[PDB]
Design a protein around this nucleic acid. Structure first.
Ligand SMILES: C[C@@H]1C[C@@H]([C@H](O)CC2CC(=O)NC(=O)C2)C(=O)[C@@H](C)C1
Lengths: 51, 185, 122, 167, 148, 53
RNA sequence: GUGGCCUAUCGAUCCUUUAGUCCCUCGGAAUUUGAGGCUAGAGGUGCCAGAAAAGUUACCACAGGGAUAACUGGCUUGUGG
RNA sequence: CCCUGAAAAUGGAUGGCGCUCAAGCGUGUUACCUAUACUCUACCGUCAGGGUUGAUAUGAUGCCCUGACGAGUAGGCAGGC
RNA sequence: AAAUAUGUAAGAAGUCCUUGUUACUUAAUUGAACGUGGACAUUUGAAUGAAGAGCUUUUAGUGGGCCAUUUUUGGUAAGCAGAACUGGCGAUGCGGGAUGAACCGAACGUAGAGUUAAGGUGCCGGAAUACACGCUCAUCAGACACCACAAAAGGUGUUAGU
RNA sequence: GAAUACUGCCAGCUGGGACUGAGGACUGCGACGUAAGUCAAGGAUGCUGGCAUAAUGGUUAUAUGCCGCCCGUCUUGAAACACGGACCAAGGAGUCUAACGUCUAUGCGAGUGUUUGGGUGUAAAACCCAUACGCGUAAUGAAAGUGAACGUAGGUUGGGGCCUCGCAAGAGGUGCACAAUCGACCGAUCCUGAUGUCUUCGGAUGGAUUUGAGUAAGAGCAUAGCUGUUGGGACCCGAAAGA
């Protein structure tokens, strides 16, 4: 009789998408990303600074 | 505002109930409304719609047409269903022993079917003895044999009958209908 | 389809939606076309009854077939009722809507800025 | 007949109500309302008075007594939305407030036939007022000017902006 | 019933259904069959071709009784025999005692041949008869004797 | 096209089912790498105005 | 090869007349003249889908028209200044 | 940009008052205002798709569920006073 | 020799393989047309949409139009006359252009809340006498498209530039 | 080597404001719970106060803020410096009829129509009825004339429904109406011309880029209704004229 919006009313959000509990529990919305130490090639930085 | 791609509030264009006030026809329509709703048999839906038809949309079905249908191989023991009147035909000299379920039977048609050895059945008795229309054969009369259709679509070179009150010479058989008098149609 | 968009430039604004925009759009304003009727999704069984023959059985299945253009994108999209978005909450950010996005207006392809527009428009 | 008839009459059988999913969860007070805080009454016959907040009653109201010996406000109920929670505080671990509750303040079943054309305090109420005043006054006297602060009324001077004031 | 007419529905509306520009008049395009060759020419030439001109020759003092000759077909020929005796004549298809059918007393002048009578001999009396008709009576074993 | 389609379907009957008989429009380009080796990007700004008359 | 190298160079009903079929009718029954029919051309409507047609009204009449002229006004400004 | 070029007749028109690092002109960024437009909810009506008979507590032209839609002259039809 | 505009096709009424009819056709057991039988799958042969798709009868009013962008004819020109495509007004309210049939926005059941369009925010008048960079001082300044006007020419006024 | 800005994400948390509370037993999907149950999960409940009447509200007059041009008509365009309208009451304009078209309802249906007339009557009513006649059941041709099955009343393509097998998907069979097409038959036109013979008659077979408002297991007749048509005063009013 009445459209209840997800993104609110967590009861409805959990009626749909049973995975939203795991997303919230493991905090996938703040996934810290593994650090990588690659560096740009000297030709890329040279042409970026080039007039 | 909406860019309406089709006419709004457009009715179906079909009859949803008989135009008549016949109480008995209304009882038949209510019996076959229940059957069409509560059964999956497409025979029930066809009969329900055919009960709504106008007098010119249910032409009489001759007993000779019934007999001709019974000559179809495998259809000899079927029940003939006519949503409309079944009329007598003196051009047929033998009639098989069958069962016909029709709205109305002329006196000559009722006598001939019984004399052959069958029985004339009303549509309510058809539903009692065949709730889904088992081994039925729906017959329909010739809609285009009406003398009103001859004048439909009148125009040059269409080969249609003009609307006239008197026939014969001196009545539209002249200029416009022969090369000897101007042109031909 | 690129020729259709190039033919209706002055009347539409379009861009490339993100997963965030698509998920929020379907969850909040997503309706189904069931028996030619606008049925709110609101439930997983409604979607699986009309798209389960194509291997789609949940609202995230529908969202997946949209974000990545799968083999049954046409059937999933045609099942979706066109979204009825509201006027933007922060406004259009432009004095006059009917200029191209490059020329300072609002119609035309706006690349990835459609996400900012749509999320405010629903 | 003047009017013919309705062919079929509406049913007189009252329908029951659907089961209502509304649980009465307890009130959540604002963070500035803790017992002993001095409040300002924004409404009522005692509006503008400085009073000392004591207890949160079961019916979401606040039991409060700006000491009756100080400003004449007795032990009474107030609505938490009709008060201003100031910053000055009074210790209240000398009062006993489990006795006071809703049925203690329940007024009367006023007889409808009881109407007054032209025109006393319970001795149990006044004794409680004395007892709680003893502890309250004995503590507020520790810190200067509180008694006079509670005795005076509150008002907005010219050029007073409550949207930027502190209370 | 005047209460079902559309006039009762046009009460209050100025033009009474006849338009504000066309302005319903007396006889805008002539009276009766006016202009069948000039301004009603398309209607004549499309819906009533052959209207104008003479065709054929004239018959002074034409009495319709001279041409009286109602036709009857073979498939309706057995209806002249009464229903009660029709079955007993149809059975026992005899030549020595065959039914006698008199189309003149039945009100017919000529018998045509739409065909397929039962294979039972009959004595058919008629003023006229078509060729293929008589061939089917004789094929069924009967005969056609002409009367006047 | 029908002759080639019939042959492809018949060949796919033996091996390679679901041969995709249908045509398709011009798809968007997939990803790629554009190498700089020997092809260092270089160009200037717009050219100023001049008559040439 | 079913007229002019292609794109224009033309004509209904009624009536008259000619050619053809030797054909149908003249209705009480026949013969012969005569007439009427059926098929195909011509005789013509140039206002060319085709009435048979001279003026005048300053003595005038009617139905209307700002669908439309003779003032002003409005747009324009060739012409005038 | 401003000025000269720059003359019409009642007294008058950036809409008015007024405005001069503008309340003018060019450009840019934000905030804000409000349509019978867009979104959500309710109600009215129309249309479409449906449910409802081991008697639907005997009205199935009834009751109910779901969705969409609603401008209007000339005009057409239907339901009503 | 464009652009725009326009014809056709993208299959089951199809494709392929055998072989029956004919008075047509072939030098011919050659073809033509129509068929018998057999084979082809599920992406049945591009995309998007499909509000149901088709068919028939019968009858009203209309048959004075006009405006706008773009193409365009006559005319010096016209709120002039005549055409083309589309959209409008006529038939239409609502917000803006003060004012207006056509312009901008948006098309209309009865209400509530929210957000906007076009247009605006000194006061009239709801909304910043907001912010930022510059230009102008007119003893006839200027101040929003349709639109209710101004030209050639000239100025050590002032600013920027070659 | 860090931070910050900018852009983006969170199925991160949280405060204040406003509008709304539609339904009326249960059913559903869920969540939290070992389970028992509980819950913000298919639409508001709980607690409290004042008044119980002109208090809210309706009506009406007035005031205030904003808006509002005179209706009807002709017209591309009306508030128009276009026309009618000083005011009020009563009257005032698509009717009936003959014939007909489409559609709808009804009765009977290869038939249909009693009411010209007759019988009868409680007397312009109701009831009953013969023979005729009208329309239909046959068309075509100018006419004399002729006059509708080679065939399961044909073949093909679709075709609802029904039947068989199938859990089904589907595959077969029969396929009314209807639509397209090729055939067959009847009449007219053109042609060919058998036996025979009042030797000029008869017209058998066999055909065709011909033609019909035809046949091919009838649908009509009658009554009634809206709408439309023609003639009538003809939706109402109005000429200058003519006899
Ligand atoms: C000029 C002359 C006569 C003309 C024609 O007959 C004149 C009229 C006569 C009539 O009253 N009604 C008509 O339809 C035609 C015709 O045929 C030409 C060849 C020869």
């Amino acid at each position: 009789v009445l459209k209840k919006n997800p993104l609110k009313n967590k009861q409805v959000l959990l009626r749909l998408n049973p995975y939203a509990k795991v997303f919230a529990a493991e905090k996938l919305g703040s996934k810290k990303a593994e650090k990588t130490g690659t560096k740009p090639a000297a030709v890329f930085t040279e042409t970026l600074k080039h007039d | 505002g909406i860019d309406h791609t089709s006419k709004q509030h457009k009715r179906s264009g079909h009859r949803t109930a008989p135009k008549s006030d016949n109480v008995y026809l209304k009882l038949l329509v209510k019996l076959y409304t229940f059957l069409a709703r509560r059964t999956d048999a497409p025979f029930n839906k066809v009969v329900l719609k055919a009960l709504f038809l106008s007098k010119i949309n249910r032409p009489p079905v001759s007993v000779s047409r019934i007999a001709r249908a019974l000559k179809q191989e495998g259809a000899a023991n079927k029940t003939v269903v006519v949503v409309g009147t079944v009329t007598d035909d003196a051009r047929i000299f033998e009639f098989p022993k069958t069962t016909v379920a029709a709205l109305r039977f002329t006196a000559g048609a009722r006598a001939k079917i019984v004399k052959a050895g069958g029985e004339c059945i009303t549509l309510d008795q058809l539903a009692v003895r065949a709730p889904k229309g088992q081994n039925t054969l729906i017959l329909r009369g010739p809609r285009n044999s009406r003398e009103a259709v001859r004048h439909f679509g009148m125009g040059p070179h269409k080969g249609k009958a003009p609307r006239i009150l008197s026939t014969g010479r001196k009545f539209e058989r002249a200029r416009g209908r022969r090369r000897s008098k101007g042109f031909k149609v | 389809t690129l020729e259709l968009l190039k033919l209706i430039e002055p009347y539409v604004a379009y861009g490339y939606p993100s997963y965030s925009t698509i998920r929020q759009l379907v969850y909040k304003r997503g309706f189904g076309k069931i028996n030619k009727q606008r049925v709110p999704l609101s439930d997983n069984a409604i979607i699986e009854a009309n798209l389960g023959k194509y291997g789609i059985l949940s609202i995230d299945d529908l969202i997946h077939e949209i974000i990545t253009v799968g083999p049954h994108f046409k059937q999933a999209n045609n099942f979706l009722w066109p979204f009825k978005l509201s006027n933007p909450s922060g406004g259009w950010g432009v004095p006059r809507k009917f200029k191209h996005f490059i020329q300072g207006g609002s119609f035309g392809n706006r690349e990835e800025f459609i996400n900012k527009l749509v999320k405010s428009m629903n | 007949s003047a009017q013919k008839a309705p062919k079929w009459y509406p049913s007189e059988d009252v329908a029951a109500l659907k089961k209502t999913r509304k649980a009465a969860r307890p009130q959540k007070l604002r963070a500035s309302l803790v017992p002993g805080t001095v409040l300002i009454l924004l409404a009522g016959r005692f509006r503008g008075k400085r009073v000392v907040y004591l207890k949160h009653l079961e019916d979401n109201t606040l039991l409060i007594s700006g000491p009756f010996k100080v400003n004449g406000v007795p032990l009474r109920r107030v609505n938490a939305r009709y008060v201003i929670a100031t910053s000055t505080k009074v210790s209240v671990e000398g009062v006993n407030v489990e006795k006071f509750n809703v049925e203690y303040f329940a007024k009367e079943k006023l007889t409808k036939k009881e109407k007054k054309e032209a025109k006393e305090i319970k001795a149990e109420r006044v004794e409680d007022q004395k007892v709680v005043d003893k502890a309250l006054i004995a503590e507020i006297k520790k810190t200067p000017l509180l008694k006079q602060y509670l005795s005076a009324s509150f008002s907005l001077k010219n050029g007073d902006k409550p949207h930027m004031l502190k209370f | 019933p005047s209460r079902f007419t559309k006039t009762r529905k046009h009460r209050g509306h100025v033009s009474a259904g006849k338009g504000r520009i066309g302005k319903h008049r007396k006889h805008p395009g002539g009276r009766g069959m006016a202009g069948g060759q000039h301004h009603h020419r398309i209607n004549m030439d499309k819906y009533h071709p052959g209207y104008f001109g003479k065709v054929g020759m004239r018959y002074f003092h034409k009495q319709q009784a001279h041409f009286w000759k109602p036709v009857l077909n073979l498939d309706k020929l057995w209806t002249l025999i009464p229903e009660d005796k029709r079955d007993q004549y149809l059975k026992s298809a005899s030549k020595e005692t065959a039914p006698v059918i008199d189309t003149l007393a039945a009100g017919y002048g000529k018998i045509l041949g739409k065909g397929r009578i039962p294979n039972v001999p009959v004595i058919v009396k008629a003023r006229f008869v078509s060729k293929l008709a008589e061939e089917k009576i004789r094929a069924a074993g009967g005969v056609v004797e002409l009367i006047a | 096209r029908v002759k080639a389609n019939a042959a492809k379907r018949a060949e796919a009957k033996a091996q390679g089912v679901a041969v995709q008989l249908k045509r398709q429009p011009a798809q968007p380009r997939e990803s790629r790498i554009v190498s700089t080796e020997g092809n260092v990007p270089q160009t200037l700004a717009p050219v100023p105005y001049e008559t040439f008359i």
